[PDB]
Design a protein around this ligand. Sequence first.
Ligand SMILES: Nc1ncnc2c1ncn2[C@@H]1O[C@H](COP(=O)(O)OP(=O)(O)O)[C@@H](O)[C@H]1O
Length: 298
Amino acid sequence: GSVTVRVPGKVNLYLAVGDRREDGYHELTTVFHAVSLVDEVTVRNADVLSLELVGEGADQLPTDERNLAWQAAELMAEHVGRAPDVSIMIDKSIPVAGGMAGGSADAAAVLVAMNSLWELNVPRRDLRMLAARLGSDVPFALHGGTALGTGRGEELATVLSRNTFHWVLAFADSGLLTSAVYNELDRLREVGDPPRLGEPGPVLAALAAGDPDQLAPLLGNEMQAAAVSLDPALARALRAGVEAGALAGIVSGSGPTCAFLCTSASSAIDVGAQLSGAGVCRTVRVATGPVPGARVVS
Ligand SMILES: Nc1ncnc2c1ncn2[C@@H]1O[C@H](COP(=O)(O)OP(=O)(O)O)[C@@H](O)[C@H]1O
């Protein structure tokens, strides 16, 4: 028998980055938002641990220990004292090297799929502890929906929305090195005052009300000035999406991926068509959010 689990990629609707300290850590507060670009991960009992990926960028990815999904299987098996005697087949649609944390998504899917394949139901709290050891975006991939996160090792606070939101997401081909982005954020903070965000209250309120008009100008990312300084083309890409009809655009996380909020599914399609036509991006996709975290779909 087989289990398959669907797990979404994410965007950051809000990201505050604390001042650097030692050894060079920045505390983060973030509103993670899972969207309907998803991987499907299928796990079977097998003689030995194995991993295969298929889908658009599947060719780029390690299929051994370097793959987070491979570590997830190891950790999950070890937690219940078992050998990771499973084979894992990942059907990938979350854009690879996209900033949407697809590898973290797959890791969380493997935890859930093994839980179910082995008929164990280790408790959610144990799966979240394993997520935390795996890496900083695995917990949100298990959690999904929308959640406010407040540092690592801290829980995620669930945030419910009255309505679905409609997104156009735009991808460069090269990303940006997250270390480059932090260094430049530190620099911009030594030499000036780049955008500083208020606290996430207003963002959460707009989110709870299901109201894209209220949410749009509250979207924000303290990493965005650094990313646009390293990658001046992002600024034009952001203007272009809004010119095409989006309510707002921001860079998601460390960038360079750009998230544009639209009023509706129709409008997102129009915006996407125009941005795709304007060649400011390598790839343009539409998506909705929030969607659920890792869950069995077989
Ligand atoms: N501590 C870490 N250092 C570097 N990469 C990490 C770490 N933890 C998780 N990851 C990343 O999670 C990624 C998921 O990949 P993918 O979503 O395709 O692109 P993105 O990582 O830009 O969101 C893996 O490629 C891996 O690089």
